Every structure is written in structure tokens, then in C-alpha cells.
Amino acid sequence: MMVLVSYDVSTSSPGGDKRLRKVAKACRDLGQRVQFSVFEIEVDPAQWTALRQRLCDLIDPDIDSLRFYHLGAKWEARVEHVGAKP
Amino acid sequence: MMVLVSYDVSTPGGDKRLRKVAKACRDLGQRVQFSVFEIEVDPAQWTALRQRLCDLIDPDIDSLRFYHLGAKWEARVEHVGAK
């Protein structure tokens, strides 16, 4: 299944850089970092459960947010990219 | 239809560009994170908004990604953390 993970990391508090680094590292083997703070994760349900717990644990929920969107299969979302591909 | 719009904006003039993108989306959706918008548009409205978004960003250094979330997308989104 595809889960889209959007991480809104604080810029007005310390350590946001490190937290994003750790979130990105946790997503590295199960997905693609498609924008600075957005990850497309290709996972079965158990892999998602495991990864989700790590992501929740790695952020600071007082100042960061995660949104998780269950997309079904990537082709169903008819994804479009406009602009840069760093 | 629900289109999720994720704007990856470069960190000069970027603040202004994010503000203009948010303003263009304001009547057609919800800004659910700093640079992510849940946009509810019919196809004609999407054609119009999408063109505006393309014109408002700097495609050399910014990006947009658009996702069609489908019906009953509300049952398939989880929020964790600050709001």
C-alpha cells in the first residue's frame, strides 16, 4: 500500500534539522523522499505499523506535526510533480 | 474532488511565494500544515487553480506535488502533533 508522510517541522525551535534527518533515515529503506519533508512509503500493514510508531516517537509533537495519508496504491492518486527535483 | 497540494518552497522571496500560494488556495481548501493544502475543487476549478499555482511558484527552486485522494479520503488521513 502507499502511505504519504508529510512532516511539518518547527523552524522557530532548536533541533528541527536533526529531527527531520532522523525521520528521513527511518523512511529511507521503505520509501522515497519526494520533497524536502514529504515521503512516499511503500509498505504492507505490519511494516506501516512499525514505521508509524518510530515516526511518532522521533518528532516533537508539541511543535511538529505529521500527516499520514493512506493512498491505496500510488497509481490511484494520479500524482503530478511541478518544478524542481533536487 | 480532493486534491492534496504539497508545496516545497526554497529556504529568498520564498516567504512571499508561500503566502501567495496560501492566498490562492484560501477559498477552495484548508491549509492543514505550513505548506500543505487539502483542496476541494471541481475539474474546472482545479484547471484554474493549478494554472495559478504553476505561475506563482519558482519552478527552478520550488516544487509542487498534487495527489488525488479520492472519495472518503477523510477516513484515510491521520494527524499527529501540533495544530
Residue numbers in the entry:
A (entry chain A): 1 to 86
B (entry chain B): 1 to 11, 14 to 85
What does the paper say about this structure?
Cas2 is a universal Cas protein found in all types of CRISPR-Cas systems, and plays a role in new spacer acquisition during the adaptation stage of CRISPR-Cas immunity. In this study, we describe the structural and functional characterization of Xanthomonas albilineans Cas2 (XaCas2) of a subtype I-C CRISPR-Cas system and provide experimental evidence of pH-dependent conformational switching involving a hinge-bending motion during activation of the dsDNA nuclease function. Overall, the structural features of XaCas2 were similar to those of other subtype I-C Cas2 structures, including the protomer fold, the dimer interface, and the conformational state. The XaCas2 protomer contained an N-terminal ferredoxin fold consisting of a four-stranded antiparallel β-sheet (β1–4) and two α-helices (α1, α2), and a C-terminal segment including a 310-helix (η1) and a β-strand (β5) [Fig. 1(a)]. Although activity was observed under neutral and basic conditions, no dsDNA cleavage was detected at pH 6.0, consistent with the suggestion that the XaCas2 structure crystallized under acidic conditions was in a catalytically inactive conformation. Together, the functional and structural analyses indicate that XaCas2 is a metal- and pH-dependent non-specific dsDNA nuclease, and support the hypothesis that subtype I-C Cas2 proteins undergo a pH-dependent conformational change to allow metal-binding prior to catalysis.
The crystal structures of XaCas2 were determined to resolutions of 1.65 Å and 1.75 Å at 20 and 4 °C, respectively. Data collection and refinement statistics are summarized in Table I. The root mean square deviation (RMSD) of the Cα atomic positions between the two XaCas2 structures was only 0.07 Å, indicating that the two structures were essentially identical. In our crystal structure, XaCas2 seemed to adopt a catalytically inactive conformational state, as was also true of several other subtype I-C Cas2 structures evaluated previously. The crystal structure of the XaCas2 dimer exhibited structural heterogeneity in the putative hinge regions between the two protomers. As the electron densities were well defined and the B factors were relatively low, the two distinct hinge structures of XaCas2 probably represent two stable conformational states, which can be alternatively adopted via movement of the hinge region residues.
